Design a binder for this molecule. Structure first.
Ligand SMILES: COc1ccc(-c2nn(CC3CCNCC3)c3ncnc(N)c23)cc1C
Length: 450
């Protein structure tokens, strides 16, 4: 009767981290349908609404259908979790595709924004507000050239409370409407976020920027911005006009999603030089955000693995009723499973069969040795991604990040200026204003108490 998620679906692999929880690629055990499952930890994420309100929103979301909005198929609830089962998209984030292009024009910017507005307009007709629209919530349907955009996370912000941790709110500040900051907001907040996104498409720079999260919000709240950057001289007047209307401070004076679809700009440019400088700035901006994000996730994984190594060792020690330092495969599974009850982070192993497979992957690579391998398996996933993000950021292949650049990266990561300079002095007392990768990594290690 009360159907169980894992009776119907098996996890195949991880798709990554989104807002409110992790996303797993899953497969229906009978029909073979692939789906993306977002798993929200009730312990980690507080609800803003009562159960019956969430159920009703979900029943509505399942019935809604639009080409630029993620399809939701199913919803489950158990003791500790919510499972949102939707269509899986394989084209990745819009901005990562954009930075892979040789050229990008207003026609490309217009076709992108028409799609977002068209998705937004439909959802507003149905009384659903996103609130947290940003490039990271804009997925490409597949790898194809003319790939449709699919907006993810519509409706969730109404029912769940956002994380206050910086690793979860990288990038959020540039896109939030000022009225959301003060508490009285409605669907016009999504037109604002779209206007900031459009501003970034045409210039590659946020209209409201600053050295850290609070600086950005101060700029957003004041609400002022300019088209005084030289890359605007190359942009149509009617595009700015649209941007001005979408970024109008008083929401009741701000243009609707529906009316923005009928704006000259959308109408003219969805039927013409390449914005070279914009692509360059977007590429720098994406590189900066991803490195900052990878840095904070690396530090977290290191603190998590420090916690869980000590925890698993004490569990395995107590289970060592022999005292001989060794355990069976059966007991190793009971202790690994027990580590998974206490903690609530492994979305990837939310089933008894999943834990047996991870254990078998570790055994193929004396509980002490098993503990090292089981936990290095967790951290090296985030460690390899750090290095990859460092290499991506270092676009000139110099091998080094300058002091100016660290300041930008640590500003975006909300690591205090005095704090990271002190850490650098401790890694290299003679440093000459630049760090290679291993020094950078050494700094992050010191910034999470290691
Ligand atoms: C609210 O329900 C949601 C939200 C996002 C996703 C989702 N999340 N993600 C993770 C991506 C990982 C990279 N950052 C952007 C999001 C997905 N990847 C492919 N297809 C998807 N459907 C997703 C899935 C569901 C069921």
């Amino acid at each position: 009767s009360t159907a169980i998620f894992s009776d119907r679906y098996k996890g195949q692999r991880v798709l990554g981290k989104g807002s409110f929880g992790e996303v797993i690629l899953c497969k229906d055990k009978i029909t073979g349908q692939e789906c993306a499952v977002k798993v929200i930890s009730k312990r980690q994420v507080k609800q803003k609404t009562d159960k019956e309100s969430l159920l009703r929103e979900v029943q509505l979301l399942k019935q809604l259908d639009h080409p630029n909005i993620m399809k939701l198929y199913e919803f489950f609830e158990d003791k500790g979790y919510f499972y949102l089962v939707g269509e899986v998209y394989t084209g990745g984030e819009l901005f990562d595709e954009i930075i892979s292009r040789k050229r990008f024009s207003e026609v490309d910017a217009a076709r992108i924004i028409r799609q977002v507005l068209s998705g937004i307009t439909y959802m507003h007709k149905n009384k659903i507000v996103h609130r947290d629209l940003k490039p990271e919530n804009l997925l490409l349907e597949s790898k194809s050239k003319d790939a449709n955009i699919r907006i993810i996370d519509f409706g969730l912000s109404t029912h769940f409370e956002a994380s206050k941790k910086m690793k979860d709110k990288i990038g959020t500040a540039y896109y939030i409407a000022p009225e959301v900051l003060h508490g009285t907001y409605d669907e016009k907040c999504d037109v604002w976020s779209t206007g900031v996104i459009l501003y970034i498409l045409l210039s590659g720079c946020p209209p409201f920027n600053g050295a850290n999260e609070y600086d950005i919000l101060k700029k957003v709240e004041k609400g002022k911005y300019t088209f005084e950057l030289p890359q605007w001289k190359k942009v149509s007047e009617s595009a700015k006009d649209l941007i001005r209307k979408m970024l109008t401070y008083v929401p009741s004076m701000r243009i609707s999603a529906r009316d923005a679809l009928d704006h000259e700009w959308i109408q003219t440019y969805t039927k013409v030089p390449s914005l070279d400088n914009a692509i360059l700035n977007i590429r720098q901006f994406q590189g900066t955000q991803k490195l900052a994000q990878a840095a904070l996730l690396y530090m977290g994984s290191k603190l998590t693995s420090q916690d869980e190594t000590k925890e698993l060792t004490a569990i395995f020690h107590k289970m060592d009723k022999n005292g001989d330092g060794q355990l069976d495969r059966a007991e190793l599974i009971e202790g690994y499973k027990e580590l998974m009850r206490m903690k609530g982070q492994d979305a990837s192993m939310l089933d008894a069969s999943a834990v047996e497979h991870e254990v078998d992957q570790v055994l193929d690579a004396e509980y002490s040795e098993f503990v090292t391998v089981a936990m290095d398996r967790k951290t090296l996933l985030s460690r390899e991604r750090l290095e990859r993000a460092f290499r991506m950021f270092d676009s000139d292949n110099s091998g080094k990040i300058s002091s100016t650049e660290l300041a930008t990266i640590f500003g975006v990561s909300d690591v205090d200026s005095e704090t990271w300079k002190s850490v650098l002095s401790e890694v290299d007392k003679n440093n000459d204003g630049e760090v290679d990768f291993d020094e950078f990594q050494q700094m992050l290690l010191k910034l999470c108490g290691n």
